[PDB]
Structure formats: C-alpha cells, structure tokens
Amino acid sequence: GSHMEKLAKNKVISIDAGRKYFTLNQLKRIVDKASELGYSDVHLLLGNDGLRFLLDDMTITANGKTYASDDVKKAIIEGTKAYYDDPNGTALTQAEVTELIEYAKSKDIGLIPAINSPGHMDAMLVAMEKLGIKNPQAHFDKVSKTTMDLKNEEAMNFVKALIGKYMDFFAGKTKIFNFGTDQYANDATSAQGWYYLKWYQLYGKFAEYANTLAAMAKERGLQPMAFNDGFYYEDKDDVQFDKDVLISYWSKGWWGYNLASPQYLASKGYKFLNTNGDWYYILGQKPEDGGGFLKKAIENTGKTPFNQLASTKYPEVDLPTVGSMLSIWADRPSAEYKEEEIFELMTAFADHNKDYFRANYNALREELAKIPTNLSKESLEALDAAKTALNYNLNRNKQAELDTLVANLKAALQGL
Ligand SMILES: CC(=O)N[C@@H]1[C@@H](O)[C@H](O[C@@H]2O[C@H](CO)[C@@H](O[C@@H]3O[C@H](CO)[C@@H](O)[C@H](O)[C@H]3NC(C)=O)[C@H](O[C@H]3O[C@H](CO)[C@@H](O)[C@H](O)[C@@H]3O[C@@H]3O[C@H](CO)[C@@H](O)[C@H](O)[C@H]3NC(C)=O)[C@@H]2O)[C@@H](CO)O[C@H]1O
C-alpha cells in the first residue's frame, strides 16, 4: 500500500549544532519530540563553521606526518572559539554522541551527522593554521575565512583524513553521512562562489573533492549525502559528479547564484531529501529581518506541500524524494535557542502531514517495559492477546486507535 510508502519516507529535523553548541540533553529532548511527533531521523550538523564534535582519539595521518591527538583537539577547540566562543560549551564528546545514537535508536530515531567542507569550515581553517598548515583559506576578492583552497594539497589531505576519522566513527552507527559542500567561498566572492570556480577553472577540482568524500563514505558503508549547490551548477555536465549522493535539495538559488534545478538533477539520476528552504528557521529571526523567521516557517509548513522541492510546483512537478527535512539554523549563534519555538514548528510540520508521520509510540514502550520475565494461565493469555493486537504501523492520524491498544495492554498487565 501507499500507507506503507509514506511512513517509509524520511521525516527529518535538522539542528545547526556546528555554529552553536547544544548540550547532550538538549539534543536528547529534540529526538524525544522527534519520536513523539513521528519523525524518523535527527540531522545533526556537528561541523558547520564551528567544529563541535571531538573524538576520543583525534590522531590525524596526512602529508607524510602525523598530528598528535592532543595537538589536533587543542587546535580544533581554538578554531571553534575563533569562529564563536560559545559560553554554553565548545564541543560534544565521543561518549556524548554515542549516547545520543543509542538513545535515538531506542526510539526508532536515526541520526544523520554532518561535517561540512569545503565551505563552512572556519574552525578547521584556523585549526590547520595552528597545526602548521599555512594559508589553507581560499583566495578571491579577499582571503576567505570560511572556505578551503582546493589547490592547497596539504590542507586538502588533512581535511580528507580528518573527515575520514569522523566517518570511521559513524561507520556502523549511522546510515547516512552528510558532507555538505554548500556555498563555496561566499564571504570571499560576494556569494558567487560557483561562478568564481568556473571562472578560475577550479570547478572540476571541486567535483574531484566531493567525489572523494562520496567514495570515502561508501567504502565505510555510509550513504553519502550533500547539499545541492555544487552539483551540476547551471545545468552543465562538463564536469561529472558521483550519482550515488543523496541530494539534500534546499534551493535553486537567486540571481547570479544559478544552481541546478531539481529537474536537471533528477534527470541525472539523483534522489532527493526534500530540504525545502521554506521550512527554514534561523534562531532569533524576526518578521522584519525577512527570510526564515518562525511564523513564516510555521506558515509554509502548511503552504508548501511535503513532496514539493524548492523552485517547483507540486504535483505538477513530481520528482522522487526519499522524504523531507525541516531545518533549524544558528547563523547568529549568540541568539537564544528557545526549545518551544522548535517544538512548535516541528509539531506544525507533523500536523500538516499526519499520513507521513508516525503515531506516538513512547507510551507503548513504557508499558512494554513494565512486563516481567513472568508473574497464572488465563491472565497470562490476556497479556499475550493484548501484546498480539499491538499495531506498530500506525500514523499520526491514528493516535486514538493506538491509545486504545496500549490501554488494553495496561489493563491486561493487571491480571493476577
Ligand atoms: C535581490 C534578489 O533578487 N536576489 C538576491 C537575494 O535574494 C540574495 O539574498 C538571498 O536571499 C535568499 C532569499 O531569496 C536567501 O535564501 C533563502 O533563505 C531562506 C532562509 O534563510 C529560505 O526561507 C529561502 O527558501 C531561501 N531561498 C529562496 C527564497 O530562494 C539567501 O540566504 C542564504 O544565502 C546566504 C548567502 O548570501 C546565507 O547567508 C544564508 O545563511 C542562506 O544560506 C543558507 O540558509 C541557511 C539559513 O539562512 C543557512 O544557515 C545555511 O548555512 C545556508 N545553506 C543551506 C544549505 O541551508 C540570501 O540571503 C542576495 C545575496 O547576495 O543576492 C541577490 O541578488
């Protein structure tokens, strides 16, 4: 059935935890709401401008030398603080992120980590400076502060190795790994990075870098994901890209930022994670700033259909997507993270799409945790009968249907 097909789609909440620090227990609560509302995954940006995740062993092997774990950690902490010294914290630990993956798993919530490059790597650039790698930054109208110079082999080799060590960690723990590749040297090019790459004949060198990260992910058993920006820019295929990359499509761009359409990308075989920019919320964004403020995001949650990719009209244009992603951003990371706002937008998105989202199984899990190894024939058959009649396939339209079933389990649990 199509009932099966909709629930099998991805419902993802994206948290910008690269720019701004989130506590283990803050993220823990997001995945709780995600589970309750009927989401399937939490997308967690850990490298996005700042680098807010440190492994237990951060020993990097690149350029014929090795970088001591302690030297690497110290470098990264300084870089993340150079981007933005968050008073709430710097980086999540291995032990914390492991806990979140196992916690999310217990609630049928997948995790999708994101470590961003070659753009959005302010922290890594500084970390590499501190580590002995000179001038890792891209250079156009000015020296970039966000983007790696694709011609710096020493910088490229380090980042490749560093992303490899993160990937080694998520191998076996998560299905997907997002490497981003969005908005190249936007600070240094007046938001025309792709135009500057093609102008300086470095776009092929960009695809070569992205294809590497795609292959690195595959060989480690991770589904590679990237944003759409750099893929077949301006609908040109003079430079080819890896076709197995799950495209998180957010926008077709604006004047002078001529991104590939979803149609052109789909014609080349790409499957989409619908990351429509309409559903965007930037922390502390006000209706007067324009763009992605809360009440527009909550409004577009109903105005923009679930399967509708940015720059297209549904169902007139019906392109294949594995599901949808709702994205929360921290562009000014000093803005207050108000949990209520995110929970409200998450709810709205779920409420407008009750046939895609799952019912709330949290009550059921607590009631099933109350049944013992054994505690009387006839009363034990009612316990088996209620356990049989449980339906794990119900969507958000059927909470009542589910509640009745859990109630029958609660009643049957009190026999003898
Ligand atoms: C004047 C004119 O006609 N055109 C150009 C301007 O539009 C352009 O300024 C841009 O404006 C667009 C809006 O049209 C905006 O993109 C939008 O972002 C909204 C949420 O921020 C979202 O609701 C909306 O769907 C989306 N696109 C639309 C409506 O088409 C631009 O914002 C981008 O890009 C700038 C780069 O200049 C970044 O600073 C922003 O952060 C944002 O990038 C992404 O968005 C999120 C949330 O903001 C970030 O956190 C992410 O890091 C980032 N990437 C991803 C993958 O999400 C932009 O402001 C100007 C720019 O010069 O040019 C005019 O010619």
Side-chain angles (χ1 to χ4, degrees):
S2 190
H3 171 244
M4 249 191 277
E5 290 193 65
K6 290 184 177 183
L7 288 164
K9 283 205 165 205
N10 293 266
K11 286 77 56 170
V12 193
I13 176 66
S14 175
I15 308 298
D16 185 8
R19 290 188 170 105
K20 187 183 171 74
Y21 180 84
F22 280 83
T23 64
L24 166 59
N25 287 295
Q26 267 170 334
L27 300 168
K28 238 157 170 286
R29 284 183 53 81
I30 295 157
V31 329
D32 208 10
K33 253 281 158 171
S35 194
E36 293 193 329
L37 292 169
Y39 288 86
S40 62
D41 306 77
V42 175
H43 176 266
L44 199 62
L45 291 130
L46 300 165
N48 189 226
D49 291 322
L51 216 198
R52 304 199 179 272
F53 177 43
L54 293 167
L55 306 163
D56 286 351
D57 176 48
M58 287 287 276
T59 308
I60 299 309
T61 329
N63 306 300
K65 75 177 75 178
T66 73
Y67 306 82
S69 177
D70 285 349
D71 290 330
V72 173
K73 286 180 180 175
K74 196 210 165 200
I76 285 165
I77 287 169
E78 284 165 323
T80 309
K81 285 178 170 184
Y83 164 66
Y84 168 68
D85 195 346
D86 204 322
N88 292 322
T90 308
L92 293 163
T93 63
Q94 174 160 153
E96 282 177 323
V97 171
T98 307
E99 224 232 80
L100 191 65
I101 294 164
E102 268 305 294
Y103 178 76
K105 193 192 192 180
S106 66
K107 296 184 175 297
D108 279 20
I109 302 300
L111 196 87
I112 307 165
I115 312 289
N116 217 163
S117 74
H120 291 281
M121 51 177 289
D122 307 36
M124 293 182 177
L125 295 175
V126 171
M128 283 187 288
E129 288 196 323
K130 295 281 182 179
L131 236 32
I133 304 154
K134 296 205 219 295
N135 311 288
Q137 302 101 345
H139 198 152
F140 295 107
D141 294 346
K142 52 147 156 276
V143 187
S144 181
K145 291 173 193 183
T146 61
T147 312
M148 184 166 58
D149 169 37
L150 300 166
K151 288 211 276 190
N152 193 334
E153 216 209 353
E154 191 184 5
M156 293 267 286
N157 287 345
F158 183 86
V159 173
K160 284 171 180 191
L162 183 64
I163 293 169
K165 274 272 94 84
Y166 285 125
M167 277 176 180
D168 286 348
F169 174 78
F170 294 112
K173 283 155 197 151
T174 60
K175 300 179 190 187
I176 312 170
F177 186 102
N178 187 7
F179 53 87
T181 69
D182 58 305
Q183 315 184 307
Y184 189 94
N186 263 210
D187 68 327
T189 62
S190 295
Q192 310 164 267
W194 310 114
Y195 175 65
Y196 274 67
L197 283 168
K198 296 206 174 185
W199 179 281
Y200 287 101
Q201 284 171 17
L202 293 157
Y203 185 67
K205 215 148 180 221
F206 164 82
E208 175 191 316
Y209 174 72
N211 292 338
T212 301
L213 301 181
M216 283 178 66
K218 296 201 221 93
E219 68 173 341
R220 286 161 179 90
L222 287 148
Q223 176 66 246
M225 176 168 137
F227 294 121
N228 65 266
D229 303 55
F231 282 79
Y232 297 98
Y233 178 79
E234 209 168 18
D235 309 337
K236 311 279 191 182
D237 57 6
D238 45 26
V239 183
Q240 289 277 283
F241 293 78
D242 191 296
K243 303 300 195 297
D244 305 307
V245 183
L246 170 65
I247 300 300
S248 172
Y249 201 101
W250 78 280
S251 174
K252 202 173 78 176
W254 44 89
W255 193 279
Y257 198 70
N258 310 107
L259 308 181
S261 58
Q263 295 98 321
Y264 188 86
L265 236 41
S267 69
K268 295 236 147 213
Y270 287 111
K271 63 275 100 207
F272 294 118
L273 182 64
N274 193 11
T275 309
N276 204 307
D278 290 359
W279 306 320
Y280 274 21
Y281 176 51
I282 296 93
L283 303 174
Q285 190 85 176
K286 305 304 164 192
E288 297 82 27
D289 318 330
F293 58 91
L294 183 66
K295 100 188 222 73
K296 192 203 272 178
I298 294 178
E299 176 189 326
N300 293 158
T301 251
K303 282 173 96 286
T304 307
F306 188 90
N307 297 140
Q308 200 193 265
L309 294 143
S311 75
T312 64
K313 191 192 178 63
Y314 194 78
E316 177 67 45
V317 179
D318 187 12
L319 299 163
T321 66
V322 299
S324 288
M325 183 156 74
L326 192 99
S327 308
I328 308 290
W329 304 96
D331 294 42
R332 291 101 45 201
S334 64
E336 198 182 332
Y337 162 66
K338 297 177 188 176
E339 196 180 281
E340 336 90 53
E341 304 181 319
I342 283 73
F343 280 15
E344 188 181 357
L345 175 54
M346 278 173 64
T347 302
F349 191 47
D351 278 342
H352 285 288
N353 297 287
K354 289 167 184 163
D355 39 330
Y356 287 93
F357 290 77
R358 208 181 169 199
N360 188 8
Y361 285 89
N362 266 289
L364 183 99
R365 278 185 282 271
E366 285 168 12
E367 202 68 44
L368 284 161
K370 285 178 175 178
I371 69 165
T373 164
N374 204 217
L375 189 146
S376 175
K377 233 208 251 223
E378 105 140 315
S379 66
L380 227 158
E381 223 146 43
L383 185 214
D384 278 20
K387 193 178 180 146
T388 291
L390 299 182
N391 196 144
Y392 296 87
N393 308 318
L394 297 165
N395 62 41
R396 195 165 168 83
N397 281 309
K398 306 286 181 197
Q399 198 53 51
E401 269 83 9
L402 176 56
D403 289 353
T404 308
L405 301 163
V406 187
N408 292 161
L409 182 67
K410 193 173 280 231
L413 190 38
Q414 281 135 233
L416 201 295

